[PDB]
Amino acid sequence: RHYYKFNSTGRHYHYY
């Protein structure tokens, strides 16, 4: 949990 990805909703979430 150091990087974020872009969500289709405009939100962000952890991936890596």
CA atoms within 13 A on the CB side of 14: 3
Q: How far apart are CA 13 and CA 7, in angstroms?
A: 7
3-state secondary structure 1-16: CCCEEECCCCCEEECC
Q: How far apart are CA 16 and CA 1, in angstroms?
A: 5
